[PDB]
Design a protein around this ligand. Structure first.
Ligand SMILES: Nc1ncnc2c1ncn2[C@@H]1O[C@H](CSCC[C@H](N)C(=O)O)[C@@H](O)[C@H]1O
Ligand SMILES: Sc1ncnc2[nH]cnc12
Ligand SMILES: Sc1ncnc2[nH]cnc12
Length: 232
């Protein structure tokens, strides 16, 4: 069945680091995610000072959209190059500090603390004691995790959530035989299976996402879907 075509495909931490060194970062959206933009006011309606977590954040420009609006932002990214590029691109000063609980890892914080980006693996993050969050934006994250690590990833995400929460996750649907991930194919049913017990799920959107750079992979279709998950 389609959903397990990719079951044993992996990209390692070192592979990701190398994509950044060599500049293979086609996943970055220079003008930021359009569905988040459309849904942002609602994601944030009537609250101020939320804690927002960005798994596998790369240099996502939407982190600056939350910090700008008075919210605290935490991200995790294996690549120091991506982390430093975010700060240079967003024109913010930052400090760098080692994390003792995680060997070789460190945290980069904007000068006034609004944005903290942990340079480590998401699987190691729990040892960094980062607290819990009201909000999670997940794009190019759950879809970049190796299929084999889905259950581990999902338990991390769930342990990072406060009792009341909004969790926006963006997934891609395409034919898994015609492209070896990332981005991996994460169907609705996989989402339901990982979070369905702890979260109510609502599909907010589903736009056609196919473009020339995708016909190149051999893709004849590509749909982007945005799910909102909240408490039960
Ligand atoms: N286990 C892991 N822990 C932390 N970062 C990881 C990771 N696996 C992959 N990454 C990083 O996660 C990113 C996924 S690509 C998408 C980046 C970002 N969310 C965006 O929308 O642009 C890459 O930057 C990769 O360096
Ligand atoms: S993003 C978001 N958050 C909460 N409720 C919603 N309804 C539609 N979009 C929503
Ligand atoms: S995470 C990721 N990696 C590569 N390409 C992508 N497109 C959308 N998300 C992506």
């Amino acid at each position: 069945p389609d959903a397990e075509v990719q079951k044993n495909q992996v990209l390692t931490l070192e592979d990701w680091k190398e994509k950044w060194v060599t500049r293979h970062i086609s996943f970055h959206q220079e003008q930021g995610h359009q569905l988040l933009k459309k849904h942002l006011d609602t994601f944030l309606k009537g609250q101020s000072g939320l804690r927002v977590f960005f798994p596998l954040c790369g240099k996502a420009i939407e982190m600056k959209w939350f910090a700008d609006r008075g919210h605290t932002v935490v991200g995790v990214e294996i690549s120091e190059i991506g982390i430093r590029e975010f700060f240079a691109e967003q024109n913010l000063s930052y400090t760098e500090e080692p994390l003792a609980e995680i060997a070789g890892a460190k945290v980069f914080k904007s000068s006034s603390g609004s944005i903290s980006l942990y340079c480590c693996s998401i699987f190691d993050l729990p040892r960094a004691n980062i607290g819990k969050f009201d909000r999670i934006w997940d794009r190019g994250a759950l879809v970049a995790i190796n299929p084999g690590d889905h259950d581990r990833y999902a338990d991390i995400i769930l342990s990072l959530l406060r009792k009341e929460f909004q969790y926006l996750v963006a997934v891609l649907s395409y034919d898994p035989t015609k492209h070896a991930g990332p981005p991996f194919y994460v169907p609705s049913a996989e989402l339901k299976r990982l979070f369905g017990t702890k979260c109510s799920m609502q599909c907010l959107e589903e736009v056609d996402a196919l473009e020339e750079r995708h016909k190149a992979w051999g893709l004849d279709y590509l749909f982007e879907k945005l799910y909102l998950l909240t408490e039960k």
